[PDB]
Swiss-Prot record:
InterPro entries: Creatinase/aminopeptidase-like, Pept_M24, Pept_M24_MAP, Pept_M24A_MAP1. Its cofactor is Co(2+); Zn(2+); Mn(2+); Fe(2+). This is Methionine aminopeptidase 2. GO terms for cellular component: cytosol. CDD domains: MetAP1. GO terms for biological process: proteolysis. Its EC number is 3.4.11.18. Keywords: Aminopeptidase, Hydrolase, Metal-binding, Protease. Monomer. It comes from Mycobacterium tuberculosis (strain CDC 1551 / Oshkosh). SUPFAM superfamilies: Creatinase/aminopeptidase.
Length: 282
């Protein structure tokens, strides 16, 4: 299997006029980064809806993962599920991003742009979808196998899912936020994998990335304590190879320097009064 290069992007996909755009659409930056980390009851309920819809679109696009399919095609299916359910694709026009989801094959760490790239037998494909509806965002991603994937790669994917679910299960009020990354990195290290550091989870609510940062590696200097009503993502990227990376000229696509493959899963989580709720549960 060759190292990837860019395909050709289809033209901007339309979303009907009636679907409210986030404020940042058609602007070079977003107005985000200083929003309250604890959401209102109202926002939380809205986030369950956005979460559910983001989960639906992910599951639909992942069902189309198969050798022969293009990445562009995955984006088409996600885009259509979001639009049919009344949601704007949060990534579309977010800091100039040109598509409705991120499609990250093989050695693409994250931020892959759906294009003419055709998926081949044995590939792994992460699809990261976000839904904006009722003034709020819901954010989820998963890596999907295409055809006969090598054992090495199935285990990576399975272990990355497990790391994510284990991190989720430690979410509870009064526990330090740093616990998440300690659990993730312990689990990756157990199988000789390396956890990506420069890319993180994030707080999410009425904004996409609200200023809260969730690290996926062990960093006990973070003193943040989880509180009921806080909403954030856990989205670890886990590398078979070294951490070093490059960004394509498209300004988005992050690829491992050594071209070894990498995997990721993501959910949007709520800290409840006693534990956690997965808002992007299928
Ligand atoms: Co990202
Ligand atoms: Co995401
Ligand atoms: Co996210
Ligand atoms: Na949500
Ligand atoms: Na990854």
């Amino acid at each position: 299997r060759t190292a990837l290069s860019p395909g050709v992007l289809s033209p901007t996909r339309p979303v009907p006029n009636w679907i409210a755009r986030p404020e940042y659409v058609g602007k070079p930056a977003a107005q985000e980064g200083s929003e309250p980390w604890v959401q209102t009851p109202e926002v939380i309920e809205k986030m369950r809806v956005a979460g559910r819809i983001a989960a639906g679109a992910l599951a639909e696009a992942g069902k189309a993962v198969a050798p022969g399919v293009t990445t562009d095609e995955l984006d088409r299916i996600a885009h259509e599920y979001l639009v049919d359910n009344g949601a704007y694709p949060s990534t579309l026009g977010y800091k100039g991003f040109p598509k409705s989801c991120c499609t990250s094959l093989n050695e693409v760490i994250c931020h892959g742009i759906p294009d003419s790239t055709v998926i081949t037998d044995g590939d792994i494909v992460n699809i990261d979808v976000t839904a904006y509806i009722g003034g709020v965002h819901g954010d989820t991603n998963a890596t999907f196998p295409a055809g006969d994937v090598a054992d090495e790669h199935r285990l990576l994917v399975d272990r990355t899912r497990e790391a994510t679910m284990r991190a989720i299960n430690t979410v509870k009020p009064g526990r330090a936020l740093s616990v998440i990354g300690r659990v993730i990195e312990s689990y990756a290290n157990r199988f000789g994998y390396n956890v990506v550091r420069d890319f993180t989870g994030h707080g999410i609510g009425t904004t996409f990335h609200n200023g809260l940062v969730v690290l996926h590696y062990d960093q006990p200097a973070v003193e943040t304590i989880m509180q009921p009503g806080m909403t954030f993502t856990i989205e670890p990227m886990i590398n078979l190879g070294a951490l070093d990376y490059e960004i394509w000229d498209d300004g988005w696509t992050v690829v491992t320097k050594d071209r070894k493959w990498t995997a990721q899963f993501e959910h949007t989580l709520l800290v409840t009064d006693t534990g956690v709720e997965i808002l992007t549960a299928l």
